[PDB]
Amino acid sequence: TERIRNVALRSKVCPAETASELIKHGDVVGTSGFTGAGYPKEVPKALAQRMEAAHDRGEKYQISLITGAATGPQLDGELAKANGVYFRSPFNTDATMRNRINAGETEYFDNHLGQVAGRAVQGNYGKFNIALVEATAITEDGGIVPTSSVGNSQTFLNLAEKVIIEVNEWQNPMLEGIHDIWDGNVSGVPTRDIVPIVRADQRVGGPVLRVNPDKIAAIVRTNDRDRNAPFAAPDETAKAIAGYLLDFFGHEVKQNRLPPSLLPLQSGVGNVANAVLEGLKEGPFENLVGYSEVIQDGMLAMLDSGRMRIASASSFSLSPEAAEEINNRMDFFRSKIILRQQDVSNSPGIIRRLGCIAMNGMIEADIYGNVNSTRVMGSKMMNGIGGSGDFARSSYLSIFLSPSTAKGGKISAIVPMAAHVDHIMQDAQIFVTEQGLADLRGLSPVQRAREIISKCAHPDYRPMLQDYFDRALKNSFGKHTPHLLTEALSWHQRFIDTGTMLPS
Amino acid sequence: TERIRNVALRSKVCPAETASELIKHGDVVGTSGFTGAGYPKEVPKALAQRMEAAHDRGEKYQISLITGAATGPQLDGELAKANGVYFRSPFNTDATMRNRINAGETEYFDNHLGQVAGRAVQGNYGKFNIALVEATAITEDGGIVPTSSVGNSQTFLNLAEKVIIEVNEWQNPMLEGIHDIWDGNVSGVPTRDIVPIVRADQRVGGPVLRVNPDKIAAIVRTNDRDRNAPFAAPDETAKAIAGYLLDFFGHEVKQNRLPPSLLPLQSGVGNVANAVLEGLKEGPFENLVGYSEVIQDGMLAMLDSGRMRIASASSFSLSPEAAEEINNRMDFFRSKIILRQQDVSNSPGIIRRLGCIAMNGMIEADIYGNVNSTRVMGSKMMNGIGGSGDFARSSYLSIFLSPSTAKGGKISAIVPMAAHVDHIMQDAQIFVTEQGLADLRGLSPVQRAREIISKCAHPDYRPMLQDYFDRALKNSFGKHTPHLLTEALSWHQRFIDTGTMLPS
Numbered sequence A, B: 001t002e003r004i005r006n007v008a009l010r011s012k013v014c015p016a017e018t019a020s021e022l023i024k025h026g027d028v029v030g031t032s033g034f035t036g037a038g039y040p041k042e043v044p045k046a047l048a049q050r051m052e053a054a055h056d057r058g059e060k061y062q063i064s065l066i067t068g069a070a071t072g073p074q075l076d077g078e079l080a081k082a083n084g085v086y087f088r089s090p091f092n093t094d095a096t097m098r099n100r101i102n103a104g105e106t107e108y109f110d111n112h113l114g115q116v117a118g119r120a121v122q123g124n125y126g127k128f129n130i131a132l133v134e135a136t137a138i139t140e141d142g143g144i145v146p147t148s149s150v151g152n153s154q155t156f157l158n159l160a161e162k163v164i165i166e167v168n169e170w171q172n173p174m175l176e177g178i179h180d181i182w183d184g185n186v187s188g189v190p191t192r193d194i195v196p197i198v199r200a201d202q203r204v205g206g207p208v209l210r211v212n213p214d215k216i217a218a219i220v221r222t223n224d225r226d227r228n229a230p231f232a233a234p235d236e237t238a239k240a241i242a243g244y245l246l247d248f249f250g251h252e253v254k255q256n257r258l259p260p261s262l263l264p265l266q267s268g269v270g271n272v273a274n275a276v277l278e279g280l281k282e283g284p285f286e287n288l289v290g291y292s293e294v295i296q297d298g299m300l301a302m303l304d305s306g307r308m309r310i311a312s313a314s315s316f317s318l319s320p321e322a323a324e325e326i327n328n329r330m331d332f333f334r335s336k337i338i339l340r341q342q343d344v345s346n347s348p349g350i351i352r353r354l355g356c357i358a359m360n361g362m363i364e365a366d367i368y369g370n371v372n373s374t375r376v377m378g379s380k381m382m383n384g385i386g387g388s389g390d391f392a393r394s395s396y397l398s399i400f401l402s403p404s405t406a407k408g409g410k411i412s413a414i415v416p417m418a419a420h421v422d423h424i425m426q427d428a429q430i431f432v433t434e435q436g437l438a439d440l441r442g443l444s445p446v447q448r449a450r451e452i453i454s455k456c457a458h459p460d461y462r463p464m465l466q467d468y469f470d471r472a473l474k475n476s477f478g479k480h481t482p483h484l485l486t487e488a489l490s491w492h493q494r495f496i497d498t499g500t501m502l503p504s
């Protein structure tokens, strides 16, 4: 039917290809989109084609692309294939864009997701020329109904000179009412407002994004799917990880250090975090509440089993098949989900107030429990820090989860020294691998090392880590956090040189 | 005049030595005291004597010492001399204690200062046996008036099984009224209360610490001074740094990115700090506001002149001459100063809301602008992370300031890779050295490196840094954050082996 319920605005409809012409070379473009959900699809595809042609003619044509978080093939993919992004922030999962970044062809900075709005308002990315936002519908009074995500859309709408809306009939109209958009000052000029959230299920705003209709330069009708990668069905490794964490949660409850309903849960992006939620869907903890950035398949499964009552997040980040399931049952899930601005879902003040439990994956940790979430070998970007820092530092408990090895055992996820740090020791209390769980609360670095090495390291690597740690204890410059700088990054170099961290 | 205005509690007065007998081997002891101010004095000295005597006779006697932040010679100094501390948290500046930590004789973990109360309440440090708190006075209704700091005192009083109070007649009676102690839930069991501070000058609580008088096991009448590291007059390096920073502030104001009154300021303590505060006093600004951890000489000067209108902090950090000045004029200054619990002064929710400008020192930064504030060569502790993370991550602007070299030029403060990371790139926007100022806002890591190397690095190390960077750009595993892992920590190893980072 007609998703644009506002009669007057219907006069601004033009084809995706034409709307794309509003976007000029050098422009700073703010888009909707929060990891496989709610990003604009058709105007980028059309812009990507117009860029390729322009380059071939010798015309410069690149934008700065600021988003909520990751997008999808239609946006990051198309624009990277076309070589059309000179600067990208804050988060990406597209293979082609990742290649541009790691080749030095697209400049990239992975800001903390909860801070992006505030930094944009400050002017850190420059002046916003375009806001490109996907919508479920436009209301009679001109409200823009968001889709599978909120992200930074409200901020970009405020900041941008010109606005382009994509109304996507693929998105289930029962999405209207799911979002909560606050009109208060979260990320504007100080002093900011108090955000009155005191419970994860509390709504404090309205269902629509607000914009001056005068700034709307184009409206695009679309019917295209959010495209995310499916999740790995939990294997023996992921199930073991989930088993250790559930045991830990149970022990906390028995010792009265957690409620039996736990505390508001944040679950990070990726396969491992997701696998933990599949364990929780049939766990002994009832009346659970999510206060997360994303609701992945596993979180939807907790709402389905009823083990979780409600989930706050900024987006759905579902597999192609999970996205079908929620669509066919939108009436059920609608009342169990609240989608918020990402500067609210990822507000450290709110996270700490609620006492969230943070669960995040990781590339690697060193023996002292510093965590790399991003840069393989210290230099090659994977996805980005995302909101792992927003949550790890603000949480009641910060938990990191990973297989103890990677690349079929050729890499140890527990190393003498992390090649890049995203999360300092202070920001990580609990580590879980398929080998076991390290509880680091109240421990000095040397004490942390004993736990991590003994509980979490793979048997193939444990003796090597013990060997490093023992010689560091004897020979390190200082003994507070013992290191041998000649060897600290040698396992990484050994991998680069030989394809494996195992010695010859 | 009598400092103990509650008659009932007067019966609990006893000698320091006798009071110290209440503290047993293995006890967890929480004390008042925030860097050089307001820590207990006489009971720790007596305890240290008895610990040494026990040790000399083959008997173990050690405690876990949890504080606000740093203490002074009477506490950290004496107990470290006696080898009386098995675990220490969260911050120390005593040289003897630093030696115990770096030799592995005292276990140490430097928690974020704003988080210590919460983690104590969570039980991370174990059960508190003793709270040892210095007081200015005890009021008619049994309220405890703290002294030159608040720190974690209220939390420790709540948790401890038994309480010892030191009533210190050296501390000015007019300190009564300067503190703001909240009974709200800042660091207790979730869900926490909204901390309703919307102005730096806002009081939310009352002037006294509260404790059940039945837990008070001993009261000690004392008369001993706070001891802090002496006043360091700004050298040419510090003045140059302050110069670049003030020019930057001046520029932001002229571009309308800051008000002429700037934003609430958090300043560290250091040679640079004093130069910055002096520049601020002379600069083209007005109506300044402090929302910091400490109040230093420079703030008092601006409060006196009217350049600063109010200063919020958890503690004083004054030279003996400034202490003299405030001791004689406590009536005037107490109207301009608010001393808060450190879980409030260092609350990320409040820091972000007020939009604080954070200015902190550092050991070193790598070329990508990751910051080490703590661990020389990655293994030798200096002081601790303190509140630098609380502020850096939560601030409107995060600035790090340092001489571009250390150890008389034999160490470069800009290195290929930091040997330990306290503040990731995402947490540092501005760097200032005596060489110049790097503004990193909106930049990718490679862009950050070009700015840091060109603006901040010492000319003597610049060719070496640029050489590393150029070769990494050519050879690094990925090009997003280019490194040569064979060389990354080689300058540190060169220092360890030869005493300088320079080759030939």
Ligand SMILES: CC(C)(COP(=O)(O)OP(=O)(O)OC[C@H]1O[C@@H](n2cnc3c(N)ncnc32)[C@H](O)[C@@H]1OP(=O)(O)O)[C@@H](O)C(=O)NCCC(=O)NCCS
Residues within 6 Å of the ligand: A267, A268, A269, A270, A271, A272, A273, A293, A294, A360, A361, A362, A363, A364, A373, A374, A376, A382, A383, A384, A385, A386, A387, A388, A403, A405, A406, A407, A411, A412, A413
């Ligand atoms: C860290 C992160 C990449 C891991 O995701 P994950 O699904 O839990 O981890 P997986 O075990 O499934 O491995 C995923 C990929 O990372 C690679 N990887 C993981 N650890 C690695 C390591 N130590 N060395 C090299 N590669 C590694 C794996 O090889 C795998 O790639 P491949 O299948 O092509 O070989 C992911 O959590 C992430 O993107 N974190 C950054 C954003 C974030 O922190 N979000 C949390 C809050 S929303």
Ligand SMILES: CC(C)(COP(=O)(O)OP(=O)(O)OC[C@H]1O[C@@H](n2cnc3c(N)ncnc32)[C@H](O)[C@@H]1OP(=O)(O)O)[C@@H](O)C(=O)NCCC(=O)NCCS
Residues within 6 Å of the ligand: B267, B268, B269, B270, B271, B272, B293, B360, B361, B362, B363, B364, B372, B373, B374, B376, B382, B383, B384, B385, B386, B387, B388, B403, B405, B406, B407, B411, B412, B413
């Ligand atoms: C990092 C820190 C020690 C620097 O202090 P500073 O006064 O600004 O810096 P200085 O140039 O005066 O040097 C201080 C000490 O660190 C050493 N130092 C500084 N940089 C160094 C480096 N790159 N390599 C080796 N040593 C270094 C100096 O030698 C000196 O120690 P020394 O007496 O043994 O010689 C200090 O800022 C700190 O402790 N930060 C952590 C806590 C914090 O930031 N709290 C916030 C508010 S105070």
Ligand SMILES: [Cl-]
Residues within 6 Å of the ligand: A193, A194, A195, A196, A349, A350, B349
């Ligand atoms: Cl808030």
Ligand SMILES: [Cl-]
Residues within 6 Å of the ligand: A440, A441, A442, A443, B111, B119, B124
């Ligand atoms: Cl801890």
Ligand SMILES: [Cl-]
Residues within 6 Å of the ligand: A349, A353, B193, B194, B195, B196, B349, B350
């Ligand atoms: Cl709050």
Ligand SMILES: [Cl-]
Residues within 6 Å of the ligand: A111, A119, A124, B440, B441, B442, B443
């Ligand atoms: Cl930025």
